[PDB]
Structures are given as C-alpha cells and as structure tokens.
Design a protein around this ligand. Structure first.
Ligand SMILES: CC(=O)c1ccc2ccccc2c1
Ligand SMILES: CC(=O)c1ccc2ccccc2c1
Ligand SMILES: CC(=O)c1ccc2ccccc2c1
Ligand SMILES: CC(=O)c1ccc2ccccc2c1
Ligand SMILES: CC(=O)c1ccc2ccccc2c1
Ligand SMILES: CC(=O)c1ccc2ccccc2c1
Ligand SMILES: CC(=O)c1ccc2ccccc2c1
Lengths: 244, 244, 244, 244, 244, 244, 244
C-alpha cells in the first residue's frame, strides 16, 4: 500500500532536475499564472510511453491556449530523456517541447505515490493537474499496460477553469450531459432557509432545491470542450507510422 | 497527507453494507468472474453525483456486456441511498440497478484514500477498476466540482480486457492512436538476445526493437470502443430534464 | 467500553455542521442565554427516530417556554436531513423547526460516546441536557429499539431550573413524590455545627437534620411539570397516522 | 474525562459486596433468568436518595412481576447501608427489600463511569438496565440535585421485553405515541428487494417502505405500561411524611 | 506490599473533608503551633472502632493539655460520621468532640498506606503522630481485630515533647525504665574526641562513653506520664455499658 | 518515599544472617508453631537500643509463655552483635538470649521499610508481629529518639492470640476497656439476615446489632494481660544502673 | 562483575561519616596538600583486619613523613569502630590514630567497587592511593583471606612522589631493580626527532632510544625505600601477642 498528496492540497514544495534544468514546483508555474499537468511514465524508449508523449506534443497548442504547461517524469536520467526526445523527432517527426523530470532514486515518485505494486522500480502513468495557485485539482493513476486518453486531460482543465470562473459545478460527461446537456450546476444550498429562498427565486431551472443549473458557458467554451471529445472519437486521417 | 491502495495490489478484503445487502469485496465479484468499478460520491441528493448515477445507469448494459459490475459509495446510510434512488427513478425516469455502499464512519473511505483536503467528512469522486482476480488495475480521483467522463471508464475496462486477452499493451488514445490507430503494442524485449530475435523474425511492424505492434483486436471490439467515445463526443438528441 | 463527557463538565467546544448552518457548541446557545438538549438518532428515514422528531416538534413551544433549544444529530448528511424533514412535513403534517447536526465521520459521536456496541456505524439515542453556562446537567442513553419519553426531558429541564433558582434538590417523581408531594429538599448540612443549627431552627418540615423540605415552587411551576406527565399518560385524541 | 460501559456490551464481570452478601454481576441475575436495574446514589442519609429508595420499594412488586430485580450502589459501607435502611423503615414505614452495593474505593463506580465532575468522591444517580443474558440495554445519568422518575424505568423495561418478544421497535412515548398510539414498529427493510416485497405484501399499515407498524401487544401489557405513566402523572392520595 | 510516608518526612500536603469542614493538613495544625494525632478505623458503626473513639474522647483533655489535636479517618461519608457520633452520644453518653476525615475514594488511605491486605476497601487502625512543624514523629499500624492502647499514644507524645525540649533520647518503658528509671539519655558522642571529652567531664552518670543520662524531667512531667500508664493498668471503677 | 509489607500478608520469604546462624524467615518459626516479633534498632552500642534489649530480655519468659520468639535487626555485623551482647552481660548483668539479624547492606531493612527519613543508613525502631502461619499481624515504627513500651508488645500478641482462639475482636485498652472492661467483641453481622438473626437470639449483651460482646476470656488471660500493664505502670524496685 | 573509579581519574566527590566526624573526599586531603591511602576491611573485630590496622598504626609516622594520611572503611558503624579501636589499644597496646569510614548501606563500597563475589555484604581489602591533587594513582584488591603487605603501600607512595618530583618512571622492584638498581627511567621519546635528539645527547645511560635512565634520587630517598623492604623481610624481634 502507498501514500499520496490529495485534491485540495498545495502541490508539495520541491526542486526537480529536468532536461530543461532545475525547476521549483509548484512555484515555477504559480509565478507565471499557469496551471501544470505533471504526468509520469515507467521508462524512456518504451512504446506506450512514446505514444503518450506524441499525443501530448500534438495537443501542446490546446494546453498553451488554457494557460497549462506540461512536465513529464520517469526514474530515467536527463541524458536518456534527451536521447529519447531526439529518437522521437527523427523517427516520428514530432518534437517534444515540454520538460521531463529525471527521478533516479524515486524521490519525486515516492512523494507523489507514483510507485505502485505493478513495478517496485518504475512509476505507473500518474497525472497531477495543478491550478495557477499550486493546488492539486485532480489525480489519475493509469497502469503500465494502458495509455491515457489525453483529450480527457484537456476536458478536465477546461471544465475546472470554467467551474472556477462561473462558480458552477460540472455535470457528468459535460458538455454532453444526458440530463442538462451543456448546463452547469449551481452549488446546492447548505441550509433549509437557503433551499426555500432558491425554490422561491425562480432564478434557475430546478429539478429540486438541491439540483439547479443554467447555461452561462459561451458557445465557444462548449464547442472547444466538445472538440476535445470529437478528436478522441475520430479515426485518425493519416497514421504517423506510414511516414516514419 | 493521505495513503491509498495501489495498482497491482489485491483490493483489500472488507465486508461492506450496501442498499442490496452485505457483501465481501473483492470476493463477491471474483467468485462470479466479474470485474467491478467501485466509485464514490460525496453525498446523496447532490446534483453532480445524481448526473453521474444516471450516466452509469444509461451505460449499465455496456458494463454488463463486458462482464463488469458497478458499485457506488458515499458516507450516507442505506435508507438515504434507497430514498435518493427512488427520487431519481420518479423525477428523471432512470432506475439505478447497481448497489451503493453505505460508509457512515468513513471506514471504507479511509482504506481507499477517498477523503481528500476538499472535505474531511465527504469522499471525492474516486474510481477503482478491479479485475476478476480482485486486482486493482486503475485508480481515478476526480474532485467535488467536476463530474467524471463515464465513457472513459468503459474505454479503460474494455482496453485492459483486450490487453489481458491478446497479451498486448494499449497505445495512447486507443482505438484512435495517432501513430498506430487501432494497433496494439507487443510488450518490448527485456534482453539483448530477445531484441535481436524480434528484429530478425520480421513477425511485426516496428519503429525499433522496443516498438512493435499488430492489429489483433476484433472489428467488434474496436467498434464497441469507438462507440463509447462517439457517444462521449455527441450531444444527446433529447435531454432527460425535458421529460422530467 | 467507550468515553463520555460528564455531568458538571462544560460541553466540549466544537464546530458542527447542521441543516441550519455551521454553529459552535456550546457558545451558540450560551450567547443567547439558552439551555440546549442535544439528542441523537441512528439514521434519517428511520421510523422510531421519525416518531421522536414528531414528539420533540409537538413539544417545541414547551421547550421554548423553558428557554431551551433542541438540536438533533445523526451520521447522515445535511441534504438527507432536509429531505427527511420535507418527508415528515408532507406525510405527517409536522414541521421540524430545530437544527440537525450531520456527523458523517462520527467526530461528534465519538466525542459524546454515542457509538455503543449495538452499532459500530450509527449513534444510539443519546440526550445531553446543557444549561445556559454550557454545563452538562444530565445524560441519557436509550438504545436503537426504544423511543424516548420526551415529557421526561421536559420534566428534567423544568426541575433542574427550579432547583437552580430556589437552591433546592428535587425528590424522586417530582412533583408527585410519595413522601413530600411537590415539596423540594433543602441541601443537607455538611458539618456537625450546621446539623445542630438546623435541628434547633424549626424553619423547615424535617424527618432528621439531613432531610428538611418546604414548598417554595409556584403552583404554576408544579402544574406545568405535572402537565408534562399527564400528557405522557394521556391516550392521544387523534393519531397523526389517520390525518396523514 | 470519563469512560462508560456501552449498550449491547455484557455487564462487566465483577464481585460486589452488598448488605445481602457477596454476589457476582451479572451472573447472580442471569442464573435466575432475571433482568436487573443497577442504580447508584451519592451517599446514605441523603434526602433525594431516600426519596428514590422509597419510590423503588413502592414499585418493587411491579419490577418483580416483570422478572426484574433492583440493586443499589453508593461508596458507603454495608453497616451504613443497614443503618440507613433501618432509619427508612422506622421513620417512613417503608422496608427496602433489595440489596445495596458498598463501593468504598470507587472500583465499581470507575468501572461504570458513575464519578462525574459534580463530585470526585460520590456517584451521581446512574441507572444500568441489564437483560437476562447480562447485556446492558439502557443507561441513564441523573445528577445529585434531581431525583429519577422511577415509572420511566418500569416503562423502559416493559417496552424492551415487549420489543424483544414481539420482534418490534417501540415508538416515542409508547404506549401513547401521537402517530401510531400503542402500535409497535416493524424493523425497516435493509435492502431494495426487502423494501419492494414489504410495500407489495400489504401485510402492515405503512407511511412508507421504512415505516410500517401493527398492534400485536395484548391489552394487559399495554394497560400495565399506561398504569406506570398514570401513577407518574397523578398526585398521591396521601403523603408518607403525614403518617410518619 | 504497599508504600507509606516515613518518620522525619513532612506529613503530605492535602485538603481533607471532615464532619467539621474542609481543612489543609498539616497546615491547619502547624499554623496553631499544635501537634496532631491522625488515626484511622475501618468503618463507622463498627464495635472496636466505637470503643476507640470513646477511649480518645475520655483522653481529649489529656491530649489538649499537651497541645495535641485529634483527627480520625475512615472511607465512610460525613453523614455516616455524624449519624455514628449521634448514636455514640445517645447510646453510650459520650460526645466525640474531634473531627473525622471522610475518605470515600481511599485518596488519603492510599497516601498514608492505610490499606493493608486484611481489607482491600477499609483502612486498618493506623496512627500518625505529627509535631507542630508538620513532621511525622511515629507511625503505628494496628489491625481490624485489635483495639489500640490510647494511653501509649499519650506516652509517645509526652515522651517526644520532653525529648525535644530537654534535648534527650527516651529509654525503653520511660518513665519506668528498669536501668535508669525516669532518667533521659544524652545523645551519644559521634567522634572519638567527643567520646573522650564526655568521659573526661564527669558531667553525667555513664555506663560507657556511648551511654550517659541525667534526670532533667520535672516531677510534674514524670507524674503526667506515670498517670497515663496507671490508667492503662487499672480497671475503670464504672463500665459505660451499664446505663446504655 | 518508603514501601513496606502489610498486615494480612505472609512475612516475605528471606534467608537472614543472625549471631545464632542463618535462618529462613518466616519458615524457621512457622515450622515450630511459633509466633515471632522481629524488631529493629539503628546500631549496636547505642543507649536507647541497649535499654530496649534489656527490657525484651527481662520479658523473655513472658514471650516464651505465649509461644512467641524474639529476633532483633540492625545494619551492624554479627561480630559487633556478639561484642555488644557481651558488654550488656558484663556491665548490666543481663544475658540477651535471642538472635540479632546482621543487615549490613540494608537488604532486610529495605524489604521491611525500616529506613525512614531520620537516617538514610540506620533502621528506625520497627516492630513486626508475625503469627505461627507467617502472617504479619501488626507493625509499629518508633523513631530513633523514643524507646518502645515492650509491655504493649506483650499485650498485642496476647490479645491477638486470644482473639484468634475465641473468634473475637478486642476492644480499645483491653482488658481495662471503659465500655465493656475485659469483654471481647463478637465480629459484627455482614448481612441484614445475620443482623436480624443476631438481634433475635438474645445470645449476647448488645448495644445494637453491630455491637455485641461476652466475657469468654479465662481470669488467667485477663490478669496476665493486666499484669503486663501494671508492670509498665510500676516504678521499678531497684534500678540496674545501681548494681553496675 | 563490577565497576570502579580508575587510575588517573579524580577520586569521586563524597561526604563520608568517620569515627573522627564527617569529611569530604578528596577535598579534606587536597586542601592540606596531603596524599591519602583509603583502604577497606570486611568488618570490625575480625583478626586479619586487626593485624592490618596494627601494621598501618606501626607505619603511621612513615606515612606522615611522606605527607600521606590514612583512612579506613568498613560497613560497620562508628560506635563499632570506636569500640574496636578501644579493644586494640587495651589488648595489643597499639593506638589507631587515623579515621575509619562507616559505610552501613555500602554507598562508598559500591562507588569504589569494594564489593566482590567473595561477599555480597562486606568489602574485600581495597587500597586507593590518591595524590595531593585528588587523583587515583594506584588500586589494590586483596581478598578476605590474605592480609596486605603494608610496606609495599609505603614503597608505592614514596616511588610515585619521587617519580613526580624528579620527572621519572620507576623500574620494577625499585630501589633494587636487577637492571639499573636505584636508577630511575627518563620518560621515552614519543617522536622520531626526539628519539634521534636523545641518542645524539650523551646526557643519559641508554640501552636504546626508548630505555634511558640516571640516578637522580638522594641517598636518603633510596635508603627510606630500602628500609620499608628490609622491615618487610625481617621477622620482628618481639611479637605483640607476648606482652599482650
Ligand atoms: C548524462 C546524465 O543524465 C547525468 C546526470 C546527472 C549526473 C550526476 C552525476 C554524475 C553523472 C550524471 C550524469
Ligand atoms: C435505515 C438506515 O439507513 C439504517 C442503516 C443502519 C442502521 C444501523 C443501526 C441502526 C439503524 C440503522 C438504520
Ligand atoms: C448535500 C449534502 O448533504 C452535502 C453536505 C456537505 C458537503 C460537503 C462537501 C461536498 C458535498 C457535500 C454535500
Ligand atoms: C459493616 C461494615 O461496614 C463493614 C463491612 C466490611 C468490613 C471489612 C473489614 C473491616 C470492616 C468492615 C466493616
Ligand atoms: C452528608 C454526606 O455524607 C455527603 C457528602 C458528600 C456528598 C457529595 C455529593 C452528594 C452527596 C453527598 C453527601
Ligand atoms: C566478624 C563479623 O562480623 C563478620 C561476619 C561475617 C563475615 C562474612 C564475610 C566476611 C567477613 C565477615 C565478618
Ligand atoms: C553509635 C553509632 O555508631 C551510630 C551511628 C549512626 C547512627 C545514625 C542514626 C541513629 C543512630 C546512629 C548510631
């Protein structure tokens, strides 16, 4: 069994050695007003890991649009990271522009609970989504044998940033929720007086005093988020292996 | 500042009280050859949680077709669970056919690391995907303010089952991987002799001795996986709040 | 076994979440010059608990006359508390006006020793009677299977406030004591000189130097206390189940 | 700062010295197939305590008829116990037929949590109701300044024996509950399947699937319990101090 | 076994509850320049203990002339103490004028090692002779079955007070020592130089350098002490049980 | 500070070295059906200690009549014991016939609590009265400055053996008790049934059910006990310092 | 085993009770510029111990001439010490002029490791040779059965004082060493340079760079030490038992 930092906590204060140099987490991103997604992979020159790095690199523009930086993590050293990045550029034609943490003694990995029973020595496929205040907002642990759906990582940061700016909770499968579609949920009342006040308001569509929603998201916000999902659902036009 | 069970561990032995009665995890499901998705929600009669239960309930037959059972969890008691289910059936027209664990002293929540800094008293939106051997395969921690993408939970269980069956690793964004499309990855060589023998046998398409793949997934398996992501990407024709 | 606060101790300082808001105990009631009865029930949408909530609600005016506020407690959450109150108002015609604490991790339950061996997860039927100084004056532990006699809780607070205001101890079964009727007892001498001064004085009816009494309670005080017990002994005029 | 034994626990094994001899609790009463009420008082030759011993002795036949015995407890020694009983018989005309525990080192007091903050040295007015299996069923803690309502101890024991024999829970204020009067509650369903089958049985009057009741108590058992509360409510015809 | 305070130690600082009120030991006596005898008995309304209280009461003036107060101790409460004193004055015609400590939790009993193996719950017949500086000078432990010789307690305090004021040690059986009669012992030399100087002074009757004595006690001092032993030896003219 | 063994406990098993040889306590005396008085003195060739050794020696026949052996104790060695015994025989004309324990490391002294605050290195004037079963019956602690009353030690053993043989308790100042003279007390009733049975038989003189006595002692028992006290009270015929 | 103070350590600070009064070691002797020989014996009025005391007493002037005081030690008390000195003066005709420590709880014994397996209760024949700075210079432990050679104790202090004043080491059997006779050894070089600088000087007789000596002791110094050994070797002309 293992130990983790938690949703709602500040990302633990640490210096990390990356292939772009030493950076301090979370302060390096906080000071820039930037969210970051820190993710891990078992080892360099591994095939599922390579496909994830290519997926992330291809979506890099979508992340920069949301004010989100990316940072990778494996127990491999900076030299392996750089040779691996060179290999991907040369054989796949995709430059990886974001840093990768070298975690040789698994100092960062043990702090983030990235070592699971599947490997004593290599991190699983962890994801920490950290907001511009350096707070952990979402944590995912995918295994060695299964690649992530990177479009879901985009949907999560887009939905979270929306939730924060409009003061709303996001329904299941947004923006295609099967009850309220692209509707966003008003935080429910926490007192009986508040409940009564809302159900006399008439200000929101309601199924009950605890279930109110409106549609305050721009058409652009809704279609941006839906575009992530359509990309994930779409059979690719040209497979990159053909031209490699 | 919390501790979780880990991918590759057995789901911890525990007797739990559900609105369907008392069961032993993971035995109850192992003895049936079933996988199970244990997920949690903060409290009954909450709006994001309600949208997630309807979402799971609409996908119930998809889960059942894969041999996956569902079981929810909150700190609310069985009588609340049943009253909440009655409300959903009555007001939304959707029956919740799967059990919900009652965890009032947070005994299960603490074992599974479901209590994060966002609330000392209520569980975040955890997901534990457990195979028919009772082994944790994947763990997701979504926060109070953000509903899950239930189609990604279907893609995860479908891809892991395919990977176990076909002895393959699954590329990022499968079945729409940008490098190899619906291709599955051969576990890479672990020795130099194996590396040489792989590259000499010419038995698979390859970018290097560590990156080989084939297309062994049935057309039905691929299309079922694409169907989950197409549903995720499409706005439903009619929203359930309209006939509510 | 387990642990409890004790008669004569200050109610433990604690912030609690109720369906009326967050309040500090006992400060919230001290600061209003009010006694409070804190009571617990196992779970929302339980029948004995429902009968007790209705009994307390019917007696709300009687507690208000004594400057006593009511606060309930169960491990269920506030949304369950509010839905349960709405069910009682709709189906029995009785509005519950007093707050209910939500104690999902049993934090308040353990502090007040409300978790007995009958249930690891749900509180028994505890009663804490607390005066306007925040001092615990009386504690009752009724089990899952037995509802409380709420008229005895009225008699307890009425007789305690009478004792406080007249400097008197209250005999068994007051105001219908089989020795002295509605009489109240003078605190006995604690020294041989006090015992002699008392037997020389002739100020009180006495059976001995340690058993003196008088009748300093108003007929209003006596008859109000007797009314509580006559209501407990009275077959009700119309059963609330009929009116539904 | 105190530690109590708990409802549902076996009364703790102990040898006690009484003014009737040495006995083992709860074995002495279990062996006779008896329930017992253990109750405490601060000291011999105290006036509220005397009024309570007289109340219990007056009700002794009522306890005996229920298969219930009484045992007292203070920190005073056996010779003081016998002198006090003699004083009560001589001066009030009432024989105390049941034993009193002598607990001079507070060993029994500390085991049962009978030392509260009102007195470091002297027991409050504790009540332990123990069944014929030796299991604690109810616990009451009255203070120094307030006598018990002994008719409520009779109602507690009668209602418990009825609930145990009829497999029913007992409503608030039974047998005068304002919702169902002298009706007794069917323990609610613990599963959705039990809840459907119960609603579909039409076997019982119901307000909901979790609130069902019938009237299986004999007229005699109901009238026995109403008798206790009528005695509590009525001013005695003559007071024992008058003929003293 | 068990522990005790020791000769030469200060009587331990403690607040005690007596039938005359609350007092601090040893300060209450120290502040008056009075010695005290603290003594204990197992329980009120015991026959040997009654004989000893009557013996002490008969000797009260004799103690008073030495500037020695008396204070008793049992584990019974002050109300038992006062009832017992009343019984002695009524039935034996003797008033007990000195306080008795009430020690119901054995707090004082455990501090002074008065709980011996004869009873786990009741003090043996302890005696603590404490001077006006609050220092324990002598300790006696009589058992349950054997009354004290109170005249020996007077001889101890008289002999100690003479030893103190005349700077002398007191021989065996003083004032009727078989070797030197009413003589008192010069404390022996502690050096060879002191030993030679004592023997070269011829100031004292001596049997050796270590055994010197004189007769510095007044005739009044010696006769007071002979009177205590005379009274112990002579049968009383009139037994008190005659006119019961 | 300070620990001791206790009345009612077996004298602690120990081998001691005496000026008569090595002996096991208490087995050496138990084996012969003898009681023993163990007493201590600070040091050999001390004046008060010398007077007490002569007092005990003069009373040796009186101890032997009762079946009681004497054994002394100090921290001085065997050779010093024998040289001190010789000095007493030579200078006072009195043989000391009983053994003295040598306790140079304070092994026996620490076990019996004979090291009080008056001296860290020398034993106070302890007295342990041990019966033929090896049970400690009475313990006295006299200080450095005050010699014992040896006649009181005879009266204690006599009165104890009499209590044991006649199944009686011994009143204060026996056999010159101011209430009942040479009467011995019947151990009081411990139950109400025994108290009633006693007060009915009229078998004894009674002041109450707890205070019964008779006069079962032989005139020899009474007069031998009084003779010890008359000896304590009598001015000696000729002082032993005279013939020296 | 056991535990000692060591050569080169300061003698442990302690206040000891002697037959000359209380003194502080080593301060009492350091403050006078005097060495001291502390020596132990098992018990007073033992024959080997007596012979050793007479041997020291005969050599008292030889010790004084060196500025060496003597002090004995047994577990016996000061009164025994003084009586034993009286016996020696009267029966042997020898005065013991030096103090003896009284150590009845073995406090000093345990500190100086004087309690060996030969006796748990009495010291062996310890010798502590302490210089005028309070430093332990030599330690001898003779057993119960073997008296010391007191002339070797004189030889040790004389040779140490010569070594100290002349900056020399003392050869085996000095002043009759078989290699260098009354020669004293120059402390050897501790470095290569010093070794060379020694052999380059003709300053001293040498067998090697590490074995240099001269004859710096005065004839009187040598003759003093020879006289101690000549006394050791010679049978005394008159044995003290004869004129005793
Ligand atoms: C090439 C490389 O990754 C690397 C990184 C850190 C090192 C630290 C110490 C020594 C060699 C290293 C090589
Ligand atoms: C109705 C309900 O949720 C429930 C669940 C568990 C319980 C355990 C003990 C007592 C009452 C309970 C009620
Ligand atoms: C609706 C409800 O009972 C409730 C109360 C408190 C909560 C705190 C955090 C998250 C959800 C909550 C739901
Ligand atoms: C009758 C009474 O109070 C009593 C009971 C037991 C005892 C045991 C030992 C000594 C005295 C006792 C007195
Ligand atoms: C008079 C008496 O024994 C007494 C002493 C202390 C008490 C403390 C609390 C309650 C009653 C008490 C009675
Ligand atoms: C003479 C004396 O007191 C004595 C007694 C016993 C001993 C045992 C061991 C060593 C010395 C002893 C001296
Ligand atoms: C006479 C003697 O050696 C001696 C030594 C020390 C003492 C300490 C306390 C009491 C008496 C003592 C006698």
């Amino acid at each position: 069994p293992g130990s983790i930092p938690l949703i709602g906590e500040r990302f633990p204060e640490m210096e990390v050695t990356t292939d772009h140099g030493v950076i301090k987490l979370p302060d390096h991103y906080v000071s820039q007003g930037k969210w970051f997604v820190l993710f891990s992979h078992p080892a360099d020159f591994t095939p599922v890991s390579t496909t994830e790095f290519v997926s992330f690199a291809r979506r890099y523009e979508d992340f920069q649009r949301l004010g989100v930086d990316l940072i990778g993590l494996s127990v491999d050293s900076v030299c392996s990271h750089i040779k691996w990045k060179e290999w991907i550029e040369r054989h796949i034609g995709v430059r990886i522009p974001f840093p990768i943490i070298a975690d040789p003694q698994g100092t960062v990995a043990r702090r983030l609970g990235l070592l699971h029973a599947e490997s004593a020595t290599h991190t699983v496929r962890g994801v920490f989504i950290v907001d511009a205040r350096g707070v952990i907002r979402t944590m995912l642990y995918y295994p060695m044998e299964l690649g992530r759906l990177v479009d879901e990582i985009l949907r999560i940061v887009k939905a979270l940033k929306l939730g924060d700016s409009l003061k709303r909770a996001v329904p299941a499968d947004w923006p295609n929720n099967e009850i309220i579609g692209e509707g966003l949920i008003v935080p429910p009342p926490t007192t009986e007086d508040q409940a009564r006040a809302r159900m006399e308001s008439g200000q929101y569509r309601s199924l009950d005093w605890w279930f109110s929603w409106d549609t305050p998201a721009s058409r652009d916000d809704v279609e941006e988020a839906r575009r992530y999902l359509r990309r994930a659902a779409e059979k690719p036009a040209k497979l990159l292996y053909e031209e490699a």
